[PDB]
Amino acid sequence: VIFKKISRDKSVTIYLGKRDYIDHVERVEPVDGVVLVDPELVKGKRVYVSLTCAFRYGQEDIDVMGLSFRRDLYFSQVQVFPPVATTRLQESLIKKLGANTYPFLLTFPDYLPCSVMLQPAPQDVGKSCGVDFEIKAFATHSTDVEEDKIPKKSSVRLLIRKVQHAPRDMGPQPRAEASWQFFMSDKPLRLAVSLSKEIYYHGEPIPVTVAVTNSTEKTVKKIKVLVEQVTNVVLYSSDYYIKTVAAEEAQEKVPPNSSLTKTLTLVPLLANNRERRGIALDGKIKHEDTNLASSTIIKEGIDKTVMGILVSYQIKVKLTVSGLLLTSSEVATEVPFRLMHPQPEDFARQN
């Protein structure tokens, strides 16, 4: 399946192999495509293709001051026409389309975030924001460069996604486990939480093993296990969101001088969430192929602020503990894990 889009004036048509380009940490899948020009309508002009990654912040509200912010995180441009290595997709598209088809290759660097965006809920303090990736093909004249204008009718833009996949090689995953001792009157309530591994895939079930050892004279009335998505906007405005994307409540008691081990399975999915606002996604709410944002992966030496939006996941265990008799207390603890797409194997989107 090839994805095509044509300029208003039909002088420039762009063809891409895919909408979604894979980041698997080691390297990023480059954007290889072709531009089909109409020789009469290009005439004495030059056609370029650009790859822009930008962070954006702000939304249009009636009677609320317009506030907009944009920061380019990467820009790269190449000339396709007139022509100045190739790939199988290009060679095949050229033969399929004709002699007015010209190839382009734009590469991603290693310091960029992946597709993340966020539209807030009514109770949420800050505004709409996200990281977009735009492939734009456009024609310029030599009096167009002289006035600094690139006519819109001669241009065509595609909003591609950079998608986080797990790296191809990685050693056998350590279990993600922590333990806490909550002394209550100098008798310990011990809580251990353990996951099977550190990295889970979108759709993969997460087996959360909870081990309560109650040496206190109080009763654990209730055990609740959540997958929480933590979002930190780290450009323009320091917005913070924490949202439940999966929840199981065991509801089984742990009486005094007893211990209880239980494994609950959670699956953090956008489908579990009627309310799709306040949560970091990899695309727009309306689109069908939109998932929960993958865990941000900050490379060594890269300042976290250039990622724009930081997305992390954690298992939260809340224990309701009975009073003396009065009302009851609640302790809670977090175990971090990472959520991304599976390891890789060796244009308008559906609503």
Ligand X SMILES: O=P(O)(O)CP(=O)(O)O[C@H]1[C@H](OP(=O)(O)O)[C@@H](OP(=O)(O)O)[C@@H](OP(=O)(O)O)[C@@H](OP(=O)(O)O)[C@@H]1OP(=O)(O)O
Q: Smallest gap, in angstroms, from Cβ of residue 333 to a second copy?
A: 5
Which residue stretch of 91-99, 144-152, 162-170, 271-279 sits at the interface with a second copy (rule: CB under 8 A)? 144-152
Which residue stretch of 46-54, 83-91, 287-295, 341-349 sits at the interface with a second copy (rule: CB under 8 A)? 46-54
Would you say 129 and 117 are in contact if contact means Cβ atoms under 8 Å apart? yes
What dihedral do alpha carbons 208, 211, 216, 217 form, nearest 10°?
80
DSSP assignment letter at 186: T
Identify the helix (H) or strand (E) that includes residue 97: helix 88-97
Q: What is the DSSP string of 270-306?
A: GGG-S--SSS-BSS-SS-TT--BPPPP-PPTT--GGG
DSSP assignment letter at 64: S
Kindly state whether residue 351 participates in binding ligand X, applying the rule CB under 6 A.
yes
Q: Nearer Cβ to a second copy, position 4 or 221? A: 221
What gap in Å lies between CA 127 and CA 139, rounded to an integer? 35
Would you say 53 and 125 are in contact if contact means Cβ atoms under 8 Å apart? no
What gap in Å lies between CA 205 and CA 264, rounded to an integer? 10
Kindly state whether residue 348 participates in binding a second copy, applying the rule CB under 8 A.
no
C-alpha distances in angstroms, 209 versus 179, 193, 200, 267, 330? Answer: 12, 6, 15, 14, 19
Considering only residues 150-189, where is the footprint of ligand X by CB under 6 A? 151-153, 157, 159
Considering only residues 200-219, where is the footprint of a second copy by CB under 8 A? 207
In the beta sheet, which residues pair with residue 37? 12
Please select the residue that binds a second copy; options are 238, 300, 346, 348, rule is CB under 8 A: 238
- Spell out, one character per residue from 112 to 141, where the chain touches a second copy: x when CB under 8 A holds, - when not: ----------------------x-x-x-x-
Kindly state whether residue 70 participates in binding a second copy, applying the rule CB under 8 A.
yes
Q: Nearer Cβ to a second copy, position 90 or 140? A: 140
**165: three-class secondary structure by DSSP:** strand
Considering only residues 211-230, where is the footprint of ligand X by CB under 6 A? 224
What gap in Å lies between CA 320 and CA 250, rounded to an integer? 12
Token look-up 């969430």 returns 273
Considering only residues 259-318, where is the footprint of ligand X by CB under 6 A? 275, 284, 318
Kindly state whether residue 305 participates in binding a second copy, applying the rule CB under 8 A.
no
Q: Smallest gap, in angstroms, from Cβ of residue 283 to a second copy?
A: 20
Q: Smallest gap, in angstroms, from Cβ of residue 119 to a second copy?
A: 19
Considering only residues 260-289, where is the footprint of a second copy by CB under 8 A? 260-263, 265
Which residue stretch of 61-69, 73-81, 291-299, 342-350 sits at the interface with ligand X (rule: CB under 6 A)? 342-350
Intra-chain end-to-end CA distance of the chain, in Å:
18
Q: Return the one option of ligand X, a second copy, none that residue 46 interacts with (CB less than 5 to 8 A, by type).
A: none
Q: Nearer Cβ to a second copy, position 50 or 290? A: 50
Q: Smallest gap, in angstroms, from Cβ of residue 153 to ligand X?
A: 5
Q: Smallest gap, in angstroms, from Cβ of residue 251 to ligand X?
A: 13
